């Protein structure tokens, strides 16, 4: 029993991570198969940083302008090319521990392991969603760019984000593995804020169900409801609109705590119109919205990779 | 920015884990150099397990009765020895990929990573504390003794906990590398308790200094106190005693934010007697006790905001 926030295993990422250096500018790659991968933005200075043109600053770099190690061995940049927000640095010997992986591009709720990384070497690992608003509240330091964020299904490792920059309010920005950006954001210094977010409804019904299986159960109640009714609730509390492909992937979970989806909606109206009275959930004060229903079932059956 | 329960990268654990079969008992052993640690209990059967004699089951078992797995290998054992609650497996190989590593029993407060493991196979990973009443918060389900936390200061890894058993409360007991547990428990099924849990002191204290690192100093309040006066405020919410060791350790954050450790005991203080009327820390509304004063500094900037 228990129910803590879970990190995918990293090694099979820590693997791929290397230094790649341009100019002053020092940050992280993903090295796989013969492709290191970056944010373009290693390649401004802070002047070209307020309006930077990407390619006509890489017109400039020669392949040994890109100084890339993958721990104390220097790797040989042969080629180099942009791909939206991302650098592809082709080298000369391919990745000999490149896992089985994909790029995917992830959904705003879904979850990820985000393995933050500083000159090229892992330092932390941690779970972190892809907010509404598409950030990230994620925990990084100058040098983290470039560090990455991934699945693992079965043994495929699916890379979904590559960080790039932090907003104002301290979260986070980044793109996927083909460089598009999460978000209305650009790699540039200007004026970028988060929008409002808010609140991922389906994984907080996920996480009381997790807190039901686990024996915590003083928010149930008699009562039930109806998916217009539910959603008017959440658009008042600035929760996310619960949807009927929401309440099919609760299903499973529906079934083994006998409790349905709206049955749970009624609780979770009655938390948020009256809150907690003192009480805890899972040793959290907060409805907790960062365990997808698949994070729920996997930790709560004990899947490995 | 941004503060997240971080663990470290689990790689150079992961390609330790093995799984050790005993009868018709699968747990996890942890592979380094030309041994396999795992827990005793191993080698009970279904009547042995209130009173096991450890040392009259052990000498029943030559090194063929103990199938040890490590990915689609079997290794051969070659000797065995029982040291306190831990079982040693001398097998025919050394671990390829052994780390730099070492043994490090750990006291109440310090945290670690848990690579959580079922069949010989990393789960997941995520971040506990020992509890001032030595147990763990974990999320371990059956079949994931044998797995292990762990600190990686450095390029070492630190071995500090292996997991045996669950409490009636839910909460978790193990030992150290060297077999010895943690607390006052055994492993024997006989009923035994966790004793009360009490909020680790210094470890909020460190969260607090985190909290103003980040930019956030709503809390702090015009006020100091003694020492003792805190201390006898404090244990009446259930909180550790702090001790001017705790003090000391403290001296760092201090400095860095400009607050006096004793100040932000009088913001601790008002913080137990007020709640946070409907503000949050680094985006929790309870106070935090599993970050020490050393992840605080790992973790954060140098630079207070
Ligand atoms: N706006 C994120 C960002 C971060 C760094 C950097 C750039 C953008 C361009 C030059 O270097
Ligand atoms: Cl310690
Ligand atoms: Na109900």
Redesign the interface.
């Given at each position: 029993?228990?129910?803590?926030?879970?990190?995918?295993?990293?090694?099979?990422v820590?693997?791929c991570m290397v230094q790649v250096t341009c100019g002053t500018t020092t940050l992280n790659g993903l090295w796989l198969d013969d492709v290191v991968y970056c944010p373009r933005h290693v390649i401004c200075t802070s002047e070209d940083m307020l309006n930077p043109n990407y390619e006509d600053l890489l017109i400039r770099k020669s392949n040994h302008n890109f100084l890339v190690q993958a721990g104390n061995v220097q790797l040989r940049v042969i080629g180099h090319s942009m791909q939206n927000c991302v650098l592809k640095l082709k080298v000369d010997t391919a990745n000999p521990k490149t896992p089985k992986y994909k790029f995917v591009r992830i959904q705003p709720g879904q979850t990820f392991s985000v393995?933050?990384c500083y000159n090229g070497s892992?330092?932390?690992?941690?779970q972190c969603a892809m907010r509404p608003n598409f950030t990230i509240?994620?925990?990084?330091?100058?040098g983290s760019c470039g560090s990455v964020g991934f699945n693992i299904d079965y043994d495929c490792v699916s890379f979904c984000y590559m960080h790039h920059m932090?907003l104002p309010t301290?979260?986070?920005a980044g793109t996927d593995l083909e460089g598009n950006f999460y978000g209305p954001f650009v790699d540039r210094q200007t004026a970028q804020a988060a929008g409002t977010d808010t609140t991922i409804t389906v994984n907080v019904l996920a996480w009381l169900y997790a807190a039901v299986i686990?024996?915590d159960r003083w928010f149930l109640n008699r009562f039930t409801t109806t998916l217009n009714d539910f959603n008017l609730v959440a658009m008042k509390y600035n929760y996310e609109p619960l949807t009927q492909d929401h309440v099919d992937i609760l299903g499973p979970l529906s079934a083994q705590t006998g409790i349905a989806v709206l049955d749970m909606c009624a609780s979770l109206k009655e938390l948020l119109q009256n809150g907690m009275n003192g009480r805890?959930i899972l040793?959290?004060?907060?409805l907790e919205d960062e365990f997808t229903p698949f994070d729920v079932v996997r930790?709560?059956?004990?899947?490995?990779?």
């Open positions: 029993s228990g129910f803590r926030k879970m990190a995918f295993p990293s090694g099979k820590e693997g393995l933050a892992p330092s932390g690992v941690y509240k994620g925990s990084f330091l100058n932090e301290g979260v986070h686990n024996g805890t040793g959290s004060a907060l930790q709560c059956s004990g899947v490995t990779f």
